Amino acid sequence: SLTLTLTGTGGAQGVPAWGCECAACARARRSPQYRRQPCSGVVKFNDAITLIDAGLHDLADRWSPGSFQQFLLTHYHMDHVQGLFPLRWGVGDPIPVYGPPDEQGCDDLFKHPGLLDFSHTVEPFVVFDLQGLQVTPLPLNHSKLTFGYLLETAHSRVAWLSDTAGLPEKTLKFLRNNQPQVMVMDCSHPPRADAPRNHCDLNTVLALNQVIRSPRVILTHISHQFDAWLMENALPSGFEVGFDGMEIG
Amino acid sequence: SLTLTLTGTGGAQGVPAWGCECAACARARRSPQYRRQPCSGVVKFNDAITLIDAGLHDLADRWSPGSFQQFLLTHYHMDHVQGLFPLRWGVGDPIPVYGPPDEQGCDDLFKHPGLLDFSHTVEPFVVFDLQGLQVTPLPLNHSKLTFGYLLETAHSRVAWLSDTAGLPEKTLKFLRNNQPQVMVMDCSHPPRADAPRNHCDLNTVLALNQVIRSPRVILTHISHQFDAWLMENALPSGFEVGFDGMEIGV
Ligand code: VO4
Ligand code: VO4
Ligand SMILES: [Mn+2]
Ligand SMILES: [Mn+2]
Ligand SMILES: [Mn+2]
Ligand SMILES: [Mn+2]
Ligand SMILES: [Zn+2]
Ligand SMILES: [Zn+2]
Secondary structure, eight states: OEEEEEEEOBOSSOBSOTTOOSHHHHHHHHOGGGOBOBSEEEEEETTEEEEEOOOOSOHHHHOOTTSSOEEEOSOOOHHHHTTHHHHTTOSSSOEEEEEOOOSSOSTTTTTSOTTEEEEEEOOTTOOEEETTEEEEEEEOOSSSOOEEEEEEOSSOEEEEEOSOSSOOHHHHHHHHHTOOSEEEEEOOBSOOSSOOSSSOBHHHHHHHHHHHOOSOEEEESBOHHHHHHHTTOOOOTTEEEOOTTEEEO | OEEEEEEEOBOSSOBSOTTOOSHHHHHHHHSGGGOBOBSEEEEEETTEEEEEOOOOSOHHHHOOTTSSSEEEOSOOOHHHHTTHHHHTTOSSSOEEEEEOOOSSOSTTTTTSOTTEEEEEEOOTTOOEEETTEEEEEEEOOSSSOOEEEEEEETTEEEEEEOSOSSOOHHHHHHHHHTOOSEEEEEOOBOOOSSOOSSSOBHHHHHHHHHHHOOSOEEEESBOHHHHHHHTTOOOOTTEEEOOTTOEEEO
């Protein structure tokens, strides 16, 4: 069995953005269901649990040491690893952290890892196994060394693709060739005429799925500007917006 | 009116420590008043508000841009600045951040400060004014460039001294000569046979105050091991343990 929960669907700024009173941020202050925490997920394959990224600040309250099997990191920007900082001082057995071979990490995680074991680095396009789940690292287009991941079982294929601006050629072809049934994709911005540089806008996501043809694209890493746009514009069939806590089967 | 609220009184590990079943951690789970969030304070002087350190993760819920006057930072360890990372992307006027002239900061705060203005670096023993509050930076003994602060108004004096081990000579002498009525001091550790390197134990605090002679020392940055010790052992007169939400007046 393969399930995926989106625990956070925002970017670093979040929704509401601090001090902002735009339509999306004001709504999220009034109704918590519309809040967006840092982009992160939970994957459950049978009994085995993987935490994708660690930008949430309350992991120590959601989980106890030993209650999940590993972290899987996309990259070392603060909004994807800030939740590791207090966890590392816990009491328990070592916790494997799988991720890209970023040689610097973030602040002093690598020098003072506590119970976190960052030795589990992975390689582009080289499949590795997490309790039987087949995971393929996919290089993304981002200011840090950043991997997305294909998650595969006998019957299911899900892609986790944040943070990215467009996709590198080989990654794009890989996804077209290994069509995911579900793609969770960075779409920080509303439709733009050009670019952007570090994250996709909606036009870029539409262009990418013209190639990949995933039947279910779930947008994440949503900025408050995109949320405001979504309050007044519909998405095309086959696209939906993620929300914090969304469960995917 | 000068008042100080301790919004967090723990170290990086916190109380409860993640996964720990010791008596102090179990107590904090059962009785949340005993939880200890990252070492931080809120100073209110007349109308003005200063946030001392920024390790709390819920600042955006507690405050809005412009609802306080400035941040005052002791140092750039994560447990003292992690709360700044989401806030910087906010909407509003620039927010002054006063602190030591650490050339690196933490991660990409300096490169991408957003609405935070880190240009307000301060100097050892050089007084600066925060809406009438007289503040003196005091070098501490710690693995990062770290300042504590004397806060003074109308001959009322409060020292904020975390994180530190034994105090540098000049700082110790300055405090003896400017005896604070209240000192909030790093005491991460229960009493030890040897002074620890980056944070005081109780014996070091006792030794320091035998020189400074402040009549009221409030211990903070408290580890779960020290809480466990405090559950079975009393502090000497003139020393008390801080707690999250503690209110201090002068
Ligand atoms: O810090 V980012 O979520 O714009 O790569
Ligand atoms: O991260 V510390 O509170 O031991 O300086
Ligand atoms: Mn991000
Ligand atoms: Mn990023
Ligand atoms: Mn500290
Ligand atoms: Mn420190
Ligand atoms: Zn907004
Ligand atoms: Zn404990």
